[PDB]
């Protein structure tokens, strides 16, 4: 899969280490400065500017170059780029914590608000479970709002012991949109409301202690709180935000490719204010804009209404949105995909197929293909199929040699020619008796999917045996069904040795068989029973002949 040999050893993923990107890493990794917000047109001249998409990053226009990495398009996954922000921004999805963390530590000095000294704390420092420490710790220090400098140790409440210092009262905190604001109580009276600048928060975090990280659900190497705040922004490469070209002289840019375009814009404009007419706080009116975009870019289904509609009123697909359940990556692209070597038509009963069979229409059998590997055992038979062509039925439509190259049997000036080579593969037609997985959705049974014997038949319908009807739970009032074709010698095995209908006969969901006899066959098997019912020679003879395994003994 992928094609082209790589002297790179191959392995399977065993662990997935979840972490957060450190502004320094994001940089090291990147291969793109990403300074301009434009797409291309070096003054209309078509290509790409060393600005956004491909300032060395991936490519388009069917052209090798991927930083000489060549290979071009298919094979060169993306190469992240970055884009140095102007000023720190929250991480739309992290705000929650970032906030809940401050409520756990006081600024100025930045350190815990409850040491081993407070006993209710001890118990909350033994619980081994990041999710639970931080869910008890928080509950304990969200109340105390005074960075205690002296507390009564494990002895007299009279004697006061010392630790860190700076009682600077702790302001309670609330969430308004994408910013954190808190009030500092002053006694003597009346509050003191001020906005907590990211630049500030970030700092208080950078200083949080090493053991303090950990104590609170974090990790010194993979996720330091101080990273929940974005300094550098990784820039997904084309393949994540591909285009769609209507030949040439037109457009086709992807949603994402725009929010960056914005994020980028709204960044520069900020910068060009801190080195010019800087009316001090007529900037934080344009810094909220970056905190906005760089927030929405990731999540756009927030509580603070403003959907950030894109000119036309279309919502805007946020990254988060792409993964969100169903119809989405995780659940729709990974946990379940569309697949090749599959077919579906209308099912109809046929009292002439053995139970484990399935009627496949030539039409399809000539479409679906099974890759066979040229072996001295078949060579002959295979070569015949190849010659036969991809039009006659028992035949094939693709011969592929070691040299990773496909011979298209329907065009190739040598179609008629060709001598096979032990080791070559000959995608052939599905033949009478190739195990397949047949099925009828909704699949809520082991049995909703069983392995059958392919039986190529005329006319356009999957013709399944009647008794295997109730397990798929299907009628023929127009009911459709799916058929998947195995691909590796060992794959088949898995169907035939575990999925074959004859096997599914007795079901564990009810320790009783799950297929029987219905309609005519049943109804008729009663009539044909009755004492009252007798049959004469002429016929008793044919009936015998019908049972295929009749020992020939009238």
């Amino acid at each position: 899969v992928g094609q082209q040999y790589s002297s790179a050893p191959l392995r399977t993923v065993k662990e997935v280490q979840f972490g957060l990107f450190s502004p320094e890493e994001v940089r090291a990794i990147s291969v793109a400065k990403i300074r301009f917000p434009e797409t291309m047109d070096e003054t209309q001249t078509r290509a790409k500017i060393g600005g956004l998409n491909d300032p060395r990053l991936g490519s388009i226009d069917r052209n090798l170059k991927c930083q000489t990495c060549q290979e071009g398009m298919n094979e060169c996954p993306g190469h992240f780029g970055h884009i140095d922000l102007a000023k720190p921004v929250f991480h739309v999805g992290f705000i929650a914590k970032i906030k809940k963390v401050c409520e756990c530590v006081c600024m100025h000095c930045g350190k815990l608000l409850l040491d081993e000294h407070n006993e209710l704390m001890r118990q909350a420092l033994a619980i081994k479970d990041s999710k639970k420490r931080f869910a008890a710790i928080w509950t304990l220090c969200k109340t105390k709002m005074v960075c205690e400098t002296d507390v009564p140790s494990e002895d007299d409440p009279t004697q006061l012991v010392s630790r860190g210092g700076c009682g600077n009262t702790q302001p309670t905190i609330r969430k308004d949109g994408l910013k954190l604001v808190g009030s500092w109580k002053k006694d003597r009276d009346e509050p003191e409301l001020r906005v907590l600048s990211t630049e500030e928060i970030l700092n208080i975090f950078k200083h949080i202690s090493v053991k303090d990280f950990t104590s609170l659900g974090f990790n010194e190497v993979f996720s330091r709180p101080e990273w929940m705040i974005l300094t550098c922004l990784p820039v997904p490469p084309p393949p994540v935000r591909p285009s769609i070209s209507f030949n040439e002289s037109q457009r086709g840019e992807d949603d994402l490719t725009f929010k960056l375009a914005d994020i980028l814009k709204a960044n520069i404009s900020l910068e060009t204010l801190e080195h010019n007419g800087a009316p001090h706080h007529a900037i934080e009116e344009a810094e909220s804009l970056l905190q906005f975009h760089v927030a929405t870019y990731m999540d756009n289904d927030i509580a603070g209404q403003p959907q950030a509609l894109q000119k036309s009123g279309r919502p805007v697909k946020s990254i988060r949105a792409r993964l969100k359940g169903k119809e989405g990556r995780i659940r729709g692209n990974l946990m379940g995909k569309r697949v090749d070597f599959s077919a579906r038509t209308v099912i109809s009963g046929d009292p002439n197929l053995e139970l484990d069979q399935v009627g496949v229409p030539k039409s399809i059998a000539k479409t679906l293909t099974y890759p066979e590997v040229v072996t001295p055992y078949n060579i002959d038979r295979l070569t015949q199929l190849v010659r036969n062509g991809p039009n006659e039925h028992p035949g094939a439509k693709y011969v592929i040699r070691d040299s990773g190259d496909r011979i298209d049997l329907r065009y190739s000036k040598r179609a008629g020619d060709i001598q096979l080579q032990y080791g070559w593969k000959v995608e052939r037609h599905i033949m009478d008796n190739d195990p397949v997985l047949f099925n009828r959705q909704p699949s809520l049974h082991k049995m909703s999917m069983m392995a059958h014997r392919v039986k190529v038949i005329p006319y356009s319908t999957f013709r399944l045996n009647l008794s295997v009807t109730s397990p798929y739970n299907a009628d023929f009032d127009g009911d459709e069904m799916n058929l998947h074709v195995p691909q590796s010698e060992e794959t088949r095995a898995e169907l035939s040795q575990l999925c074959a209908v004859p096997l599914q006969i007795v079901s564990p969901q009810s320790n009783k068989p799950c297929m029987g006899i219905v309609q005519d066959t049943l109804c008729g098997i009663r009539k044909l029973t009755l004492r009252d019912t007798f049959i004469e020679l002429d016929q008793v003879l044919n009936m015998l002949y019908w049972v295929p395994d009749w020992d020939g003994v009238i």
């Binding site: 790589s6 191959l10 990495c69 992240f80 990784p234 946990m335 379940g336």
Partner: protein, 97 residues
């Protein structure tokens, strides 16, 4: 056609292990990426010709694996990275158990 969730669950029930994978990879996605044996990322600048491999930053050129995963997955991952989250791909367990 589609081999949606339910269809999977069935194979899982059947224990038809390999098959499941086959539907999921060979007959669909299936893709080959390279990694840094160090920082479990897709960084790797594989020139698959002059065998060069690099990965400045984690700066390698020696410890590099090659893996097979559903392109959709690679995406899942890249999409996650653009969200500044890191999914590490390691070829060996170190947490035992």
């Amino acid at each position: 056609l589609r081999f949606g969730e339910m269809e999977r669950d069935c194979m899982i029930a059947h224990g038809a292990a390999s098959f499941l994978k086959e539907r999921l990879m060979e007959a669909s996605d299936a893709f080959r990426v390279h990694i840094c044996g160090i920082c479990g990322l897709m960084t790797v600048i594989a020139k698959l010709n002059h065998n060069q491999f690099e990965c400045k930053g984690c700066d390698n050129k020696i410890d590099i694996y090659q893996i097979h995963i559903p392109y959709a997955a690679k995406l899942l991952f890249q999409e996650l990275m653009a969200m500044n989250i890191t999914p590490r791909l390691y070829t060996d367990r170190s947490r035992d158990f």
